[PDB]
């Protein structure tokens with residue numbers, strides 16, 4: 001469960017948040033495969049509640065109605081087409097599995113679902129699965145409200161309703177089997193792994209019992225014995241009885257401390273400095289690298305809906321964001337996930353975004369297709385951070401330096417640092433309020449390298465900054481604090 005199952009050489013996954021299956025399929029062939037992306041995390045593919053108040057919020061997809069592959073992203077045919085086309089070009093698909101709960105207990109009964117399936121939260125009836133009152137934790141939960149009230153009580157966190165979401169009785173074989181049926185359906189279609197949503201709200205043992213029922217990956221694409229990649233969504237920032245390490249026996253875990261701390265460092269909050277990143281990784285109290293799924297921001301916390309808090313960097317903070325993502329992609333710690341979002345009318349009131357519920361770009365509820373601009377950017381309000389030169393080129397940087405050790409670290413005791421990856425790559429950052437100009441040891445072979453942040457390597461030439469490495473591996477770097485991107489990155493595949 002710990003291996004991503006990506007093609008050899010591809011080291012990252014991208015979250016194509018709320019994208020339609022047909023658009024992801026095309027993206028796999030026209031950009032992800034050629035650019036070396038390892039895979040795609042897709043939004044929940046199972047039928048969810050259609051919420052009209054507010055109008056089709058993104059979070060409606062985290063309120064299951066059934067396991068039918070029928071959503072605003074598409075139907076089963078479209079989903080299968082996407083998984084097949086992506087796998088055929090060496091790009092994997094990871095499913096956001098919402099298996100801890102069904103929809104909110106107060107949601108109105110009826111057919112307001114993405115596939116028209118009938119459901120009655122009040123009577124705990126979900127005939128399309130089917131689930132009944134016997135399949136929920138109503139009688140197991142000991143809180144007065146029936147919802148989670150205290151995170152200091154590890155039991156209620158798992159047996160009670162997360163903000164009212166009907167909590168499935170994961171200890172029952174029937175429920176475990178229905179969930180396994182859904183996940184095996186996806187694995188047989190070709191999915192390479194899963195993000196287990198709300199894993200903190202599930203007992204480690206229950207998750208294991210479910211994972212024990214899963215199939216090996218489809219043998220038409222994967223070698224015999226391949227196990228689905230499992231990364232559990234556990235928000236553990238410390239100070240709680242439940243720890244992310246409690247889930248290591250099931251697969252990897254999302255390390256939310258990563259983006260929270262990186263954000264505070266790059267923002268220079270509380271006096272934090274980039275020079276402190278020298279021992280980045282386990283030294284900062286993070287989970288072991290081989291159990292970490294890292295990211296700068298996710299679909300939740302990029303809109304103040306998750307951990308990390310206000311320190312989280314997002315596309316809204318483009319300049320600092322690119323630097324944070326660049327550092328993450330260059331550093332060897334963990335398995336990296338890049339975020340791809342959509343723009344929404346952010347409206348802050350008293351420090352809170354009143355429009356943080358807004359769903360994907362749409363026309364009368366129908367998700368807009370992803371249009372590509374002549375400059376390779378996206379239209380229809382899709383941000384497509386993964387297409388930003390500074391991010392895409394760093395995704396490739398990580399591939400090129402895969403396996404190389406963290407070395408040749410340098411820092412000015414403030415916010416100017418640099419480091420290399422063996423003899424395959426080198427990166428320099430200037431996050432201080434003054435310019436940077438110094439000759440550093442890159443550990444790279446002599447030659448002329450193209451900076452992949454300010455430009456690209458095209459036909460034996462660089463479109464941006466050029467770096468000259470001497471016979472001793474030394475090279476001069478100049479970065480103004482006024483530069484569009486205050487960091488430079490060069491690697492073996494950017495050499496002239």
Ligand SMILES: OC[C@]1(F)O[C@H](F)[C@H](O)[C@@H](O)[C@@H]1O
Nearest residue numbers: 170171172203204205206207
């Ligand atoms: O270890 C068993 C388990 F995984 O975790 C706890 F012991 C729960 O009480 C139990 O219902 C669940 O199946």
Ligand SMILES: OC[C@]1(F)O[C@H](F)[C@H](O)[C@@H](O)[C@@H]1O
Nearest residue numbers: 204205208246247248249250
């Ligand atoms: O993740 C499951 C677990 F928490 O850790 C290991 F997987 C153990 O083998 C299992 O029995 C235990 O319930």
Ligand SMILES: OC[C@]1(F)O[C@H](F)[C@H](O)[C@@H](O)[C@@H]1O
Nearest residue numbers: 198199200235300305306307
């Ligand atoms: O903000 C995160 C969230 F939306 O609410 C709580 F933090 C849950 O523990 C987490 O699993 C869920 O994703």
Ligand SMILES: *[C@@H]1O[C@@](F)(CO)[C@@H](O)[C@H](O)[C@H]1O
Nearest residue numbers: 059062063098197198233300
């Ligand atoms: C997990 O599923 C939920 F329903 C619970 O948090 C959503 O609200 C979250 O955004 C998703 O990560």
Ligand SMILES: [Ca+2]
Nearest residue numbers: 158159167201
């Ligand atoms: Ca639960």
Ligand SMILES: [Cl-]
Nearest residue numbers: 195233254298
């Ligand atoms: Cl996540």
